Amino acid sequence: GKLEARAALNQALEMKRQGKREKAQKLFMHALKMDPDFVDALTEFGIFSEEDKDIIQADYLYTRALAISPYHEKALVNRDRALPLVEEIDQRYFSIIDSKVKKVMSIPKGNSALRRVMEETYYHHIYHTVAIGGNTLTLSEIRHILETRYAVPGKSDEEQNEVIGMHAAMKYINTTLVSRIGSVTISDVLEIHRRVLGYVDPVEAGRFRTTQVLVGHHIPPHPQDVEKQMQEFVQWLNSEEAMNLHPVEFAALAHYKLVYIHPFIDGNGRTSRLLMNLILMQAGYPPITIRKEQRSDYYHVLCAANEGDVRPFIRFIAKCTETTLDTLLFAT
């Protein structure tokens, strides 16, 4: 009941005054469980979170209270104070990424440690990018198909056609588009999807969808507007506004925007993740890995971006970038 929520909020504030923050945390949580729309509890919980310097959580609670009460004064004031702090937190984390990416590229490429890790990381990227969608092929089975050109008995042809399609897509990007000085065109995007879905679906591979499909509760553009939306997308690519963006933020936005457009029947996620790393590789960054285990988190930040806030998605891509940089620096 909602009457019980006010009591839990009063005790939460009472326990905060006495320094019993762990108990106040539970009482704040219980208040919001009794009334998820408790404007006072949402606002006071944000103040509580901001005291622990968790400004990202505080801004979420403030915004959640303002969606219910758009003119609530205490939430409006505290959200304004928290907004520069959130930007500083995101800029600080980007600076930590730049400290690690300049350290991994400082060593010469001829090092046997880097080249050995980069070689086995390639099959890791093929493994994680298909297994995050449901592919059951193991890493050793994936390496077996690509290196020996022998099929694996007991494994479906579709899962093997995905791996081989991804291998042809990465080899095309790594040897034609990464070091290319020119801009990115629509024909490049169609050529990557032709490689990705070429062996799974030779009919739809390399062409946009002509029908309006749905992506959950997310509505992609109409089919007659896809090509216009794609032309405006690649126009946002190679743009001075995008170059001024941080490489991680630029590669993350291009990832989501391509998923947002959803130009193909299938292979939209695989194509967007390839475009993400092509951008990172062009900026000197190593290709990052969105691990198979992060499937649910990958869906959550995508769903959060489809519902107004793409910053949790950018932070997710950033955390994936730091994770692969830490494993690269682990070789030394």
């Binding site: 019980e4 005790q11 009482l27 992506v215």
Partner: protein, 523 residues
């Protein structure tokens, strides 16, 4: 509006109603001036329905049409080993209906009606409702009803159904030790204290460890037995004198309901005396075939017949300390509640468990649960003299899913603060599979064969797709009442398809409950 919300202790053997009104909590006495009413229902051969003191006072002369201890049958199935074992020990007829134990009695005139266990408890709650209505001078529509802390999902839902049939909006089912803790902290504002509540009554047993703090009640760990109490203590004394009477006279009074129930009443009376005396006499004239019964029950003999049960009450105290990662020195006060805690041997075992620490005295152990239910009832009604009472109660049982191999995969662990939500992705095993079946279990054992089955749910409406492709997110929410609600939703992209869930719990449907409500309104 909600009117005046009352607090009702719906016990296995004894019920009690109280209200928080005019800045204080009061226990309300019934029409016979008694602060506590037995959970008894009887039907006279003349056609008169009796509830409470009158129903119990005629048990000996009408044992077949006298219903009691229905709390040991609510929320259970016909194949329950506890149910089948209790049939041999209850003088009234219990038949199977919809795989559930139903009570069949004679209501006079040769006509026999069959009542669900929820309908029997509804009559007891009705007597408690009318007791408060006669005191307040107005109709009572809302209430807070107590349940044992270790009640499972089916037992909790059945108790709420009993209140629905009694014409009550059960605003909250409150666990007994939590209610007892409220009664302990009503007059105290002493900061953070660790309390161990020992609830041993007529039919159930609960042990909870709570962290109290000026109106905040935080249950850290709970554990007990819903089928362990004073009724089992009386049966040990009953079975002792039945064998003794067979040894002296050669008669087997086992099949005589009138003789056995006479012995049960006098055994329960002698047990109460042995809490303050060392010897008690049991006299029953015309006990069997005109032969009188005359024996003496010693406290030492009563403790001897129940020493295994008395010692077993220490295991839940050990489990709540292990789960809470607390030692005996961390407990600030010990609170004994329930009628069976008046037994000197019980108080001795609890005291010796805690190295001689004296329990906290002051609250009547018979009424402590009823006091806290009334205080919580006053809180839910918005009473100007209740305070910011907040209950952070937990679930007693671990909710899990039966995976391949009969493995108990934990979803919501025990002692998890309620309300709580838990979501998990489920998929299909075969191509174009339209239905996925999930089996939920309650218990702490590693294999689901040893745990209690909560229910089997089926997720229908899945569109044709290859195996592993569907992504159904099933959410398991335990509400503030401790009752589970299962929902499913598609999470894959494309057309969001509705996932309908059906279960085999075979509980009382709303159409069956409305029939029982109208059958109760005809009185």
């Amino acid at each position: 509006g909600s009117g005046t919300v009352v607090g009702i202790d719906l016990g296995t053997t004894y019920s009690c109603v109280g209200v928080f009104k005019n800045g204080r909590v009061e226990i309300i006495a019934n029409d016979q001036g008694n602060r506590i009413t037995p959970s008894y229902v009887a039907f006279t051969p003349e056609g008169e329905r009796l509830i409470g003191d009158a129903a119990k006072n005629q048990l000996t002369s009408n044992p077949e049409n006298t219903v009691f201890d229905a709390k040991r049958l609510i929320g259970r199935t016909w194949n329950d080993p506890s149910v089948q074992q209790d049939i041999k020990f209850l003088p009234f007829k219990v038949v199977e209906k919809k795989t559930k134990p139903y009570i069949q009695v004679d209501i006079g005139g040769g006509q026999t009606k069959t009542f669900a266990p929820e309908e029997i408890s509804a009559m007891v709650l009705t007597k408690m409702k009318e007791t408060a209505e006669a005191y307040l001078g107005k109709k009572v529509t809302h209430a807070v009803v107590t349940v044992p802390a270790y009640f499972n999902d089916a037992q909790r839902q059945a108790t709420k159904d009993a209140g629905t049939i009694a014409g009550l909006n059960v605003m909250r089912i409150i666990n007994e030790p939590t209610a007892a803790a409220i009664a302990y902290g009503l007059d105290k504002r002493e900061g953070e204290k660790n309390i161990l509540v020992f609830d041993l009554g007529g039919g159930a047993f609960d042990v909870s460890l709570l962290t109290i703090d000026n109106g905040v009640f935080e249950v850290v760990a709970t554990n007990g037995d819903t089928h362990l109490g004073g009724e089992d203590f009386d049966q040990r004394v009953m079975e002792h004198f039945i064998k003794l009477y067979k040894k002296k006279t050669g008669k087997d009074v086992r099949k005589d309901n009138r003789a056995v129930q006479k012995l049960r009443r006098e055994v329960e009376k002698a047990k109460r005396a042995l809490s303050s005396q060392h010897q008690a006499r049991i006299e029953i004239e015309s006990f069997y075939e005109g032969e009188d019964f005359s024996e003496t029950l010693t406290r030492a003999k009563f403790e001897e017949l129940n020493m295994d049960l008395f010692r077993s009450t220490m295991k839940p105290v050990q489990k709540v300390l292990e789960d809470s990662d607390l030692k005996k020195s961390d407990i600030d006060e010990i609170v004994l509640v329930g009628g069976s805690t008046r037994i000197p041997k019980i108080q001795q075992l609890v005291k010796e468990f805690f190295n001689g620490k004296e329990p906290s005295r002051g609250i009547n152990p018979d009424e402590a649960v009823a006091y806290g239910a009334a205080v919580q009832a006053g809180v839910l009604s918005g009473d100007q003299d209740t305070g910011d009472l907040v209950l952070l109660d937990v679930c007693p049982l671990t909710l899990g899913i039966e995976t391949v191999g009969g493995v108990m995969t934990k979803l919501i662990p025990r002692n998890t603060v309620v309300p709580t939500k838990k979501s998990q992705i489920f998929s299909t095993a075969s191509d174009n599979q339209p239905t996925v079946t999930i089996k939920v279990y309650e218990g702490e054992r590693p294999l689901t064969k040893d745990n209690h089955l909560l229910g089997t749910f089926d997720l229908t409406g899945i569109p044709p797709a290859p195996r592993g492709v569907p992504q159904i997110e099933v959410t398991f929410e335990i509400d503030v009442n401790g009752i589970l609600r299962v929902t499913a939703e598609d999470k894959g992209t494309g057309n969001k398809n509705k996932i309908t869930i059906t279960n085999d719990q075979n509980r009382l449907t709303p159409e069956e409950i409305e029939r029982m409500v109208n059958d109760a309104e005809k009185f």
